Amino acid sequence: MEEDIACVKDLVSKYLANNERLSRQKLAFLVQTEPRMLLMEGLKLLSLCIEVDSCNANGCEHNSEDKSVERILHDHGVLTPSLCFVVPDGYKLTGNVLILLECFVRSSPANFEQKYVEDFKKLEQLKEDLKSVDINLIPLIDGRTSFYNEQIPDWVNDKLRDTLFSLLKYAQESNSLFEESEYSRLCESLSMTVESLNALLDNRSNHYEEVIASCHQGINNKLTAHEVKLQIEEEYQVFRNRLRKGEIEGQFLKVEKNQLLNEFNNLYADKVAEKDSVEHLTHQFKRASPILRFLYANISCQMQCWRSFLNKVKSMRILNKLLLIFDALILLASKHDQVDRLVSLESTKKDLKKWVERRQQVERSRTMQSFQKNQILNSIFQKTISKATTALRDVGISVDHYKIDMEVICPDGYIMDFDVSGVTPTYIMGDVDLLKTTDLERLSSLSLALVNSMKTSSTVCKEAYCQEFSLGETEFQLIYQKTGECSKCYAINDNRVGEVCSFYADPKRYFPAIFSAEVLQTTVSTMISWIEDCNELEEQLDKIRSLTKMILILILAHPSKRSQKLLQNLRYFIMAYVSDYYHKDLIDKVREELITDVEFLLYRLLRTLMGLVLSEDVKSMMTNRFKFILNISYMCHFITKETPDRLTDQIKCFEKFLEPKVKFGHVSINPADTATEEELDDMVYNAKKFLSKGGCTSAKGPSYKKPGVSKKYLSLLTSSFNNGSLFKFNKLTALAVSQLTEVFSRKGKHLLNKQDYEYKVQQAMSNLVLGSKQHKGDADEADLDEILLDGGASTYFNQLKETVEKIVDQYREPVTTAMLKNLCFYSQESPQSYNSVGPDTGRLKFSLSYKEQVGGNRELYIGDLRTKMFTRLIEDYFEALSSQLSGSCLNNEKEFENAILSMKLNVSMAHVSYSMDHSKWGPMMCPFLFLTVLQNLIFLSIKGRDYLSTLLMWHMHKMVEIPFNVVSAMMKSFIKAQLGTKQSITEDFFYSNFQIGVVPSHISSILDMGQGILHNTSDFYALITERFINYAISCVCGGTIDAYTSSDDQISLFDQTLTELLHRDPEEFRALMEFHYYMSDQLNKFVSPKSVIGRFVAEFKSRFFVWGDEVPLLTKFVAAALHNIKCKEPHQLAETIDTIVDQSVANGVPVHLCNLIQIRTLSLLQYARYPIDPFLLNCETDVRDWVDGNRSYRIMRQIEGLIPDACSKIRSMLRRLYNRLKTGQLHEEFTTNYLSSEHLSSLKNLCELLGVEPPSESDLEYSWLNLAAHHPLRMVIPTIVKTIQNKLSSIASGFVGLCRTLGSKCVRGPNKENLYIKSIQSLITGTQGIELLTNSIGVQYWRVPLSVVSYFRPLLWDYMCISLSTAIELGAWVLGDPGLNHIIHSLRRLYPSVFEKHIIKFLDLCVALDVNCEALSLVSHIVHYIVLSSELRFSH
Ligand SMILES: [Mn+2]
Known part of the structure; x- marks a missing residue:
């Protein structure tokens, strides 16, 4: 044993670098003969060298004695209260700026990102806490993926780790100490780490068996192909017999083009007369909105040099009264420019009324008088201009400054009297033709004015801010009072006479009209040249031109989600109009709520346009008008998509998420990392209820909207798939809150003058009452107590205790090798023995959010890296399973291209092309359904699928997080409803009855299936179901139906047999389509009402196809090109813009718009004073050779030109x-x-x-x-x-x-x-x-x-x-x-x-x-x- 110990102490004795502290660690290292002490001092030596390279690499003083942050500031004399006990690795204090360093090593990516965000959250906690002790903290995290350093060679370190691991092979060490959790944690921590993890115990506590029993309840999944056909035919015959007096006929109708128009015109009859001439429309339009009234009217250098010079000099360093001196220089420049600002717009775009200026000038001159005569003011002016001129000697000089020396030559002999004497001497409706560009030019000027008004620095009568925009030999002024990025009240005025129009909008929404002046007119001209017919010339083209121009200008002048949704429902309506059979519940989803009397005008314009376009005698052509209406919708695609209101959109997305849960009746309250009896019991009960789904054999079968799959149809599907036939200060602010609530109760004489007080008491209550309802965690997944710790970062603990107890009182009136070894050698928490619910570390913690989309707020699910890897494993396993198949079409471009070819070939023969969208694909699906459809398969080459089964079961019990803004808004609403409009929706009542108990934070249910988390599983299931349903229909009527699915929007192609059947018998075709709806609704594949069937257009993946050519779809790509100008290096910006324009010209958008968009982008770059070098943006006046050419080709072309x-x-x-x-x-x-x-x-x-x-x-x-x-x-x-x-x-x-x-x-x-x-x-x-x-x-x-x-x-x-x-x-x-x-x-x-x-x-x-x-x-x-x-x- 001691031989290899002498070899490794010889190894350290040879290959160690000469360091004194490492000779101290070597001194305590070589004197050890115990192998656990040799492992402790050896890994302490290695991680100690990691701290050597970390502290020396980042310049921080090494923390050897495990000193806390309170010890660091305690030794520097900085008094801090009792904060969190955090021991850093290295520290560095520079004045009032502290720098903390923490380093660690991890072998797995999940523990690396995990300890990365845990230490990140701890250093943000220290950042906000020491920020509350007024110390700017700079955190640094040095996470290293390897055990290497600057002290030991690589093969010597590998020999050291293989020597220590060669000492871990003995049994007496592990039998003596370091049990199998820490032994497997240590040996697997020193590893070099995967499908089918097997180092677990799999302690299933009698729960998985119950679910397997509920999955094999009545599903045969073993039938042959002789009973399936008979069963399907018998069920279809029973359904048809019921269709005579029973079922609701599938809600399918037959288009009567005139009836659709008569219903769309009378649609939304709140207050709209159905008689609108074009002239009366224009008359109402040119006087409709104050912004719209600002245009369409009958209107009619030394100063700017000084203003720019003063701004640029004030910006950097000069002093710190200054604004007073700059305004005084401005007044002198104006009074010397006697022979066009009048209110003296000063630096940072602010004006003064020339009155208090004289008062503070008198005050400054009197203060200078007591410093013991007009020359002293000039001397101050020379001092300031001398500092300006040296700061510009640094790198500026008279760089295009046009002789600012005027105030150096003229006023040397000079006066408040001169200034005041120079200042003292100094409808909205029209008819501008809709054929010129003046309207669009004024709109562009106003939009640029707003966008530049967003740039207010906001430092420190009519003391508001102002912006300037010029016109045809006149100079207007925009006035705004509140800075920032929020919606404000703007006022357009002039200096000649009044003209003070006012409005209230949001500036960051008017971007797509900054420099677009010749682009929109060309789009309109192309759209109208598309309609150069032989019948609409009889005094209709000018009306169409005026209507389209008014639509564009009303869209660009008023950004609002309502008009966007209206024109989207309009494209849906026209798709239904051109089709053959539409859904009965269509117009219910086309009507919306409109306010402000402008959306009604837009609807009147759209109605008149549809009447002028789709009147009698249209049978000449149909493709062009259909394309035109589609272009009017994707013209509504012009509106900027930037979530006009955050909190309301979050509330709406959460409501859409939760409503189908409570409609079913399986909403749960916050559980704690365990599995109690009642929740498992109701889980099993609702899983069994999920499979009831009574079919048409009963008296109330076709419910048609209830979630859940029938047992018989699932068994038929599984049997047909297994058979080879389917696919083959706190106290004072708290007392202020209490007294202001008392005011709100009784003291109502002073109605409302406490806005800021309202904000602070709202924030205090939201942070305070939620402090007693911490919705306990014990997972530390990087986000559980953030905002409650930001509000709590400046408050003492016992302070919070006394505040919460006093506020609930006043609210009741109205009614050991663990720690020293963790940070050095072994990793963080690792997956351990897991039950059939969670991974024994969490319970698949997910969080919800909204996504920015032009159609609607999509749901987004975000989680940890561990959960992400589990879902990725399930995802690519099912992706391999689906690639073994061929019908799916999600990401493989080969099969998608094959689908395009098949669709073109089918439409070319004038057949029927069924389109299908599925409503509520997210919530109505279920992981339990996936488990049940998987457990009843064969999948010949098994074992190992139990791991997939328990992984899919982990999703059965998953958690979602309610955002804190939502629950705070709900608490505010409950308080307002309890202290002081009775429109309680289901979500509000749910939140209230939950508050009567404990406030909810986490939700767990069954039919959620967060979108995108299980994408390929949904694709697989949808492919299977679509193929089975098409096989059933082909078996019933002896036809052939092909399908292509993208998991949300699918298309189906019918053969010649079904086309002949529709041409011959409409009743049988309607019955067949209602039976398809019934089959697709029995399984959880609800059909959305937007689904239309016909033989003119094919809707798939937002790409529309008709007989003959394909839809060019101009305005969508045009409006896309006008957007997406981000903050990058302009070379990459031009790269992105050229890529988008290349896609557009790969399409049908005429070239002349490519050049115009590129000129617009070059003008946007010109306005930003960025040198128009040739390698920036591609050439213009391009030839039509955008094919077979790269960007380098176009750069070469412009250089050659x-x-x-x-x-x-x-x-x-x-x-x-x-x-x-x-x-x-x-x-x-x-x-x-x-x-x-x-x-x-x-x-x-x-x-x-x-x-x-x-x-x-x-x-x-x-x-x-x-x-x-x-x-x-x-x-x-x-x-x-x-x-x-x-x-x-x-x-x-x-x-x-x-x-x-x-x-x-x-x-x-x-x-x-x-x-x-x-x-x-x-x-x-x-x-x-x-x-x-x-x-x-x-x-x-x-x-x-x-x-x-x-x-x-x-x-x-x-x-x-x-x-x-x-x-x-x-x-x-x-x-x-x-x-x-x-x-x-x-x-x-x-x-x-x-x-x-x-x-x-x-x-x-x-x-x-x-x-x-x-x-x-x-x-x-x-x-x-x-x-x-x-x-x-x-x-x-
Ligand atoms: Mn679709």
Whole structure:
């Protein structure tokens, strides 16, 4: 035993680095002969060296004596109260800023992220607590995946761990101490960790057997193919016989196009007259809304230089009264600009009324008088301007400042009297034709004004803030009082006469109309040219044009979810109108609640448009009008989707989640990590009730909306599948709350002047009453007591105790190797012996949230990494099972493409195409149903499926978290209803009767199946059920039905037999479809009322197909392109925009909109003072050759259009090179002639090698600004390394941030110093070369670079490498006339990168051409199209 101990002490005696504290640990280490003490001092040595590399790597002072944070601040003299006992690894105190460091090692990813978020939550607790002791805390977590360090070699450490593990093999150690929980925890903690985990005990406590018994209750799952057919035929015959006087006929009808219009016009008859002329509509429209009234009317430099200079100088450092001095300078500039702001809009966009200005000026002059005469004011002005001029000497000067020296020359001889004497002398309805752009231009100006008004800094009569926007030789002013991001009251006014219009909106919703002026008009023109018929010319096109323009402008002027949902129900309605058989309950889901009298006007416009489009004599064509109406809906897709209200949307999504639960009757209250008797009993009872589902054999069978699957149909399905025939200060604020509640009760003379008081008492009550109802945890899954600890981070414990007891009193009136070994060596809590309910660590803890979608708030389920891995295991197991099948279509592009081909082929033969959407696919499904359909299968090649069964059972008992905002709002509502509108909905009564007991926080039920958590299981089940139902229908009527399913929206294709049947017998077809509805409803596959069947359109995955061509679907992609401008480096922003435009042009959207959207994006970049370099965004005025072309191709195209003749010589030399780039002249000579070090001498030698030399004295004269020539642009080394490392707010706020960062410290230099863009512009200013732009791109300028400014980059080298990449990528026609293998190859070429970053024919060249430049789309593209005939003939 002691031989290998002497070998490992010899090993430490050889391979240890010389450290004194490690010689102290070596001194206590080598004197130990006990193996547990050798393991403790050895792992303490290793984790101690981890703390050495952590504290020395992060610069923190090492905590060796296990000093707490209160000990750290206690030794520094910072008095803290009794806080949480946390022992950090390293600490560093710098003034009032403390830095804490904690490090750990984990082998498994779940314990790594788990201890990561546990230590993250503890350091956020210390962050808020020491923030309440006024200390800015900087937490640092150094989590390491390996046991390596900077002290012991790798194989020596592996020999150490294999030596200690070679000491763990003896039995007397584990028999003596360190029992099998800590022994398996230690031995598995030192492992290198998986399907079918088997290191468990599987203590099923008589519960799994009961569920298996309830699953095999009456299901045969063993029948042959002779009883199934007879059973199905008998049941269908009984159903048909019942369909005469019994069942509700499946609620299927037959379209009467005129009746649908007469029902849509009379729909929603709250207050709408069904007689509206176009002229009266326009008259009401141009005077409808105050914003709408602001446009459609009959309206009719030294100051801005000073304003900008003052802003930029005030921003950084100058002082800290300052605003007073700046406003005084503004008044002097205005009074000297006598011969257009009047209220003197000062810095930060604020104005003063010229009255208190004189008063505080008198006060300042009197204070300066007592400092013992107008010259002292001028002297202060020179002091301030001198500080300004030196701060601008730093890097600015007279950079386009246009002679700010006026206040230096004129007022030297000068006066309050002059100022006041200069200040003292200083309908809404119209007819603007709907043919010009003035309306849209005014809308764009107002939208830009709002978006820029969002940028208020908010530091520290009419003292509100103002923004400016100009017009056709006039200058308006927007006024707003409250800053921030919330909806406010805005006022548009002028200075001439009144014109003070007012409204109340939200600024961050008006983004999609900032610079869109020629885009929308072209969309409208295309939509109308789509309707160039031979019948609607009789005075109808102008009405349609006015209607579409009014619709667009009303949508863009008023963003509201109501109009969005209205036009979505409109696309559903038109899909139903064009079809053959629609659902009877359709119009119930098309009517909505509309308010504010604007949505009613929108509905009147839509009704008139539908009447003008779908009147008599339409039988000429139908495709164009259908496409037009679809485009009007996806024109409602223009509205920004940014959750206009958070709390109401969360309440609504939670209500949609919970209503079907209480309708069933299995809502549970918070359990605690265990399994009591009553909940298991009611679980089994409701699982049995889930299977009752009385069929049509009874007298009340077709309930048609109740969840639950019938036992007989499930048994039939399982039997047909197993047979080879289916698929083959606290006290004072609390007393303030109490006295204000007393006021609310009795003292009502002062009605409401306590808004801020209302907020603070609301927050106090919500934090206080929820402090006594902590809804106990004991799981520590990173989110159980956050907000209650934020509110509690500044409060004492006994304080909370006395507050909660006094508030309930006043509320009753109106009515050991455990801890020292955890942090060093072994991991966190690991899965242990689990019951049939949970993993013995939790109970599959999930949490709910809402998702932003243009249609409706989708539900989202989020969980821990452990649960995520369990669900991923179930997911890919069922994914393998489904890939063994073929009918499914979720993610495999091959089968989806096959579905598209089959759909096209079927529609081309004028057959019937059934569409199907399933309502409430989330809640109506159930994991128990999955367990029951799985347990009754065969699946020949077994054992190991019991693990899958218990995993699926873990989902049977799962928990969801109610957000704290919801329960706080419910408590406020209950208090308001108890102290002081009687519309108690089911959820409110549920919350109230729960509050009578204990408040609920966690919910557990049966039929939840959180969306996305079990996606592939749902796909598998839906595939099986759809195939079985189609087989049943083909057996009943002798037909053939194909199906394609995506787990929510499915399509079905009927053969010629069913089409002939529909053409011959409508009654049998209606009976067959009602029987399909009955079958799909017996199993939990409820059909949504939006499902329509017909032979004109096919609805699948938001892609519509008709006979002939396919729907171009323009406006959806147009409005998508107008959106999504985030806060990134504008190169990546242009990448994203070009990708979206490439998808759009892969579609049917006419090219002319590509160029317009790109011009809009370039204008948005121009407005942000960001140099329009050529490599930023693609060329414009594009040819129709967006096919077979990459982004590099379009960059090459714009450079060739930008260079008249040199590109021709470059193309000639490159063709001669590519002819020599073949065998015999391999790239080794070229890669050795790379020469990316000094200059373009490589190309000089290449062109002089085989002919024409380049035209010098003009080639180097062309160069562009690469601002990221040394480092990327920061905002608060090639790209290959970024790809290797990646291998392992609102939308308007993004644009606001983009404009903010591009003005502040953004770019840095080769000296590790930050600077501005205007810094570079003031650095060049000329010096042999001026911008020399061409069509809006400020590019192409240099004379002879050869040491002060290296930000430039020649055009010829970039064009050369990009042309080489484009040529080797695709084709050789581009020179005409108008994953891991790459890593291995980069390791082969780059010698020093082998020890720095390790973790065929032309690949060497393409990877070589990426180390120098970073934006030429190489790595991104390495790892169908519909074009018009005329645009193709326009191609070159
Ligand atoms: Mn659908």
